[PDB]
């Protein structure tokens, strides 16, 4: 029923549960390092297989409290040379595999907190199988999610002005990954080497909502203070005020399309499909 | 009804039959070699058109015989300076055209042997029009599909262990192409020049199946012997044992995603969406 993901003392059980005929587990096997010749005077190429293969695990599940969700995010984001162990509840797998968060990806863990659902979180994990004895590194960096026991609106503070995000149709997605870790080929064995790096991680919060009332004032406050100002080295304070048990993080909107205002025919309100924030330097 | 594809004494009739309103024949005309000026002081660009055009034929159809299917694959994969000639049963086309298997593609021919569907093979052909008089090259390389008359299961042999693929939900797809052939622009005439190269071709076998019983043993045997071993210069023996009239081929799984184990909610079995093998050096 539950897959256990653990690192020493820290343990999270993810219920491998989903509706109907949805994919709970995908295990992809590969040989990224086979050299197949592009040319030569044969009909069929000569090949050489000399290196570790690839095994990628994709886990889809559901978590029944926010506390465990934050623990999972912290577990995935942490830089530590203590092996990360995955226990899969299926007989086609060994009892424990040693894993890295997806080898080069910004999105190893996705957590979705959708509208209408209470105490039910969507989990998507991507993990890469690494050699248990080849987890190498120097630094420990303990990831923490700031938590508080409030109830207040999601607040966005930039340049002395606070915007309160509409509760109406409000969804949150959190993406976590470790793209700066190196998973590397080794000769003569099945599984690659994991170089744990005490370096920059990916941590992104995405919001979706409908703006229903005081529409100009709400949207203009966000766009004027966040988008039309230069923020400098500092950024935006994103405060959950205890929603989902979350607190305050420093963030910035990144890229070409982090915010969209959508107007549909015959509607008296504005849709925000996406508002994206990446967590910036804070952690002493 | 039938379209004829021929090279000297070899001739394959392809029925060009399909269901309902499916696309049987697509012909794309192009000028890849027009120079349109990206800049300049005009509102609209200056152009120059100085070279051969492009004509591509995409043929969808069905074959009613596996023997003919192997002849079609052999015909497409063969290196020979003898023109590959296509006869199309439509008045918009001249009675015969000289063709190359799709110019740059690994996938000129797809043959599908789907589950159910006895004596129905799905054919997709991509062909490039070339000048009948400008087919140039040195070498002949006759492609042979290994053929035998057995009944037995598809067997995968690596390192002295043999794995029998489940018959349940078994689908076979074969993909053939000649990416190492040059189709080259010529001035002053309509069609490009075909340089036939006695060099490496693309030949790929894709399997889809559902593993119903002895699930750990069946999947572990394949993964332990093929994916978790280094195969060296050698590879895997893929033996069809006479299914579809096919015999024994030497192959290797290539890339990031040649094999997937899929687990779905509420199902007591494992789905293999793809198991993908590329044919390796074997002719002497």
């Amino acid at each position: 029923v539950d897959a256990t993901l653990s690192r020493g003392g820290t343990s999270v059980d993810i219920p491998l549960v989903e509706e109907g005929g949805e994919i709970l587990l995908s295990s992809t096997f590969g040989k990224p390092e086979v050299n197949v010749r592009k040319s030569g005077g044969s009909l069929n190429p000569r090949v050489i297989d000399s290196w570790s293969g690839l095994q990628t695990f994709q886990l889809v599940g559901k978590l029944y409290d926010y506390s465990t969700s934050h623990q999972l995010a912290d577990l995935v984001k942490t830089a530590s040379t203590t092996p990360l162990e995955l226990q899969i509840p299926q007989d086609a797998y060994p009892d424990t595999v040693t894993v890295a968060p997806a080898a080069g990806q910004a999105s190893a863990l996705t957590l979705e907190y959708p509208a209408g659902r209470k105490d039910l979180v969507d989990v998507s994990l991507s993990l890469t199988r690494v050699d248990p004895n080849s987890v190498r590194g120097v630094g420990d960096q303990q990831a923490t999610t700031p938590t508080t026991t409030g109830t207040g609106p999601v607040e966005v503070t930039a340049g002395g002005t606070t915007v309160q995000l509409p509760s109406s149709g409000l969804s949150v997605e959190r993406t976590v990954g470790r793209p700066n870790d190196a998973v590397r080929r080794v000769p003569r064995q099945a599984d690659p080497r994991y170089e744990v790096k005490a370096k920059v991680t990916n941590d992104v919060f995405t919001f979706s909502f409908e703006t229903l009332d005081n529409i100009p004032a709400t949207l203009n406050a966000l766009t004027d203070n966040v988008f039309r100002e230069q923020l400098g080295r500092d950024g935006v304070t994103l405060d959950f005020n205890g929603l989902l048990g979350l607190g305050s993080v420093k963030a910035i909107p990144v890229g070409s399309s982090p915010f969209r205002q959508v107007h549909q025919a015959g509607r008296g309100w504005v849709t925000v499909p996406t508002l994206e924030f990446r967590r910036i330097y804070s952690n002493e | 009804v039938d379209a004829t594809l021929s090279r000297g004494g070899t001739s394959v009739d392809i029925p060009l039959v399909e269901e309902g309103g499916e696309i049987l024949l697509s012909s794309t005309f192009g000028k890849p070699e027009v120079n349109v000026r990206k800049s300049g002081g005009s509102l609209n660009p200056r152009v120059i058109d100085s070279w051969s055009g492009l004509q591509t034929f995409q043929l969808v159809g069905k074959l009613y015989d596996y023997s003919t299917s192997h002849q079609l694959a052999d015909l497409v994969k063969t290196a020979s300076t003898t023109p590959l000639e296509l006869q199309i049963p439509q008045d918009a086309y001249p009675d015969t055209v000289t063709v190359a298997p799709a110019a740059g593609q690994a996938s000129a021919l797809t043959l599908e042997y789907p589950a159910g569907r006895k004596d129905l093979v799905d054919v997709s052909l991509s062909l490039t029009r070339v000048d009948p008089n400008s087919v140039r090259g040195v070498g002949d390389q006759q492609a042979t599909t290994p053929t035998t008359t057995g009944t037995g299961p598809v067997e995968v042999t690596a390192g002295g262990t043999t794995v029998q693929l489940p018959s349940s939900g078994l689908s076979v797809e074969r993909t053939v192409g000649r990416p190492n052939d040059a189709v080259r622009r010529v001035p002053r005439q309509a069609d490009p020049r075909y340089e036939v190269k006695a060099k490496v071709t693309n030949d790929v076998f894709t399997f889809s199946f559902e593993t119903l019983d002895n699930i750990p043993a069946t999947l572990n045997a394949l993964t332990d012997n093929v994916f978790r071993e280094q195969l060296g210069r050698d590879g895997v023996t893929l033996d069809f044992n006479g299914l579809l009239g096919l015999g024994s081929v030497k192959a290797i799984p290539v890339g990031s995603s040649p094999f997937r184990q899929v687990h779905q909610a509420g199902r007591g079995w494992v789905t293999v969406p793809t198991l993908e093998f590329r044919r390796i050096y074997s002719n002497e």
């Binding site: 992809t28 990224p32 390092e33 290196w51 690839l54 990628t56 994709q58 889809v60 997806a102 080898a103 080069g104 990806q105 910004a106 999105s107 190893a108 863990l109 996705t110 979705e112 998507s124 994990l125 991507s126 890469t128 997605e173 993406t175 990954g177 190196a182 998973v183 590397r184 080929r185 690659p192 | 990031s256 995603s257």
Partner: peptide, 23 residues
């Protein structure tokens, strides 16, 4: 994957990438 005169200029960094979280 890029080539000058048929030789690959891409570095054979033995570094893995694997599929992202589905969403």
């Amino acid at each position: 994957n890029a080539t000058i005169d048929g030789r690959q200029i891409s570095e054979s960094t033995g570094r893995y990438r694997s599929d992202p979280s589905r969403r």
